[PDB]
Ligand binder design. Structure first.
Ligand SMILES: [Cu+2]
Ligand SMILES: [Cu+2]
Ligand SMILES: [Cu+2]
Ligand SMILES: [Cu+2]
Lengths: 122, 122, 122, 122
């Protein structure tokens, strides 16, 4: 259990900030603030993590979602990050993400961005 | 707002079942049961959707996560679906997904599956 | 060997047309014409397929690339499809694709679209 | 035109080696040697790049495929990398990739890995 290891403030390579609490059950709750895109201030996030990971040196699987609507803006989109938490001196969350925008059916083919973010504690 | 449209029971092309409640705020909560993979019975899911979508015929962006741990099994993995809800006579949720397994750092390159699921009400 | 099975004209769900020749060695060569996006007429494609697939009912792995420059337009982008050919009465090529646009380093986070195309012979 | 800039030997974060020639037309040809996975020695690659990129500081879009069959092994799979070449003192090719294995239709849902490689000249 990486409940303690996960909980806190994380920063990615874009300068975005992810603030999360991990629950004993597997819950992830918090806020996300993106340094890029059609976004301002904090957005709610929710997700899940493996609260009983393998003890063989494997990372801890997790994922979370942000819908990009808050009281300032609505970018009609949602991002999900899927990845793993790796503990130890340089702890990291290594993710890949899918950002889907709401589109008309004609534009559905261009609805979804894919990328990768790495989060660190500093 | 597709709070009503989203809430309920959905089925994908694999025969999996997604049961979800959409909150007025943008919350998604429920359970997922996969017809395939290292999975049995129901797993908690959480996510977010755009509760005030565009009124121009665009779909409604949403995403959710499942960590594949429940009281029966732990597959040390999490899937996130990112996609859009499209309302109307044949309502659908069209998604793409990332399934990340916890791995050692040597195997991180093969940690993540990608696919696409389409959910319908029947 | 699906050299014969692959070679020919294929159509996806968007109305795009893929014309390909499979070589005995594993080469794929041909042209692609997209029904959507910043594209007109035919673009060169090249790729590779597994010329000696498993005989256990598995599909045949393959992939190809298109850079979206031809004598009519240059959309400063490339798509790669990665997937599998499935032979038999309803033959199909089931793919997932990554479309990367050239961007400045500030916009690199939004450089890459992901989607899925299914190609059929009719 | 980055024909000169692209052509040569590149190394990624896994220790794999990509040797490529860029043609004036947009062709990419060469060999790939993976440091990981079910692979040994060199495999043919082919692909395409944007031979007339934007002059606004944007990267150069490109992609290539490897089918993982050579005279030593056949891993019944193909990878496509899609990304961009960024020139200058630290030149890089930043990619995302899809690795599809041939599978039975029952296992198609787990056919495709996704990841990201960064290639440098040293
Ligand atoms: Cu275990
Ligand atoms: Cu709006
Ligand atoms: Cu074999
Ligand atoms: Cu231009």
């Amino acid at each position: 259990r990486d409940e303690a290891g996960i909980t806190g403030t994380w920063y990615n390579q874009l300068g975005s900030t992810f603030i999360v609490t991990a629950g004993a059950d597997g819950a992830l709750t918090g806020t996300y603030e993106s340094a890029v895109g059609n976004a301002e201030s904090r957005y709610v996030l929710t997700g899940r993590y493996d609260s009983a990971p393998a003890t063989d040196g494997s990372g801890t699987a997790l994922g979370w979602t942000v819908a990009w609507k808050n009281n300032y803006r609505n970018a009609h989109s949602a991002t999900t990050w899927s990845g793993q938490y790796v503990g130890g001196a340089e702890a990291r969350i290594n993710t890949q993400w899918l950002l889907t925008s709401g589109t008309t059916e004609a534009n559905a083919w261009k609805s979804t961005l894919v990328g990768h973010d790495t989060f660190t504690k500093v």
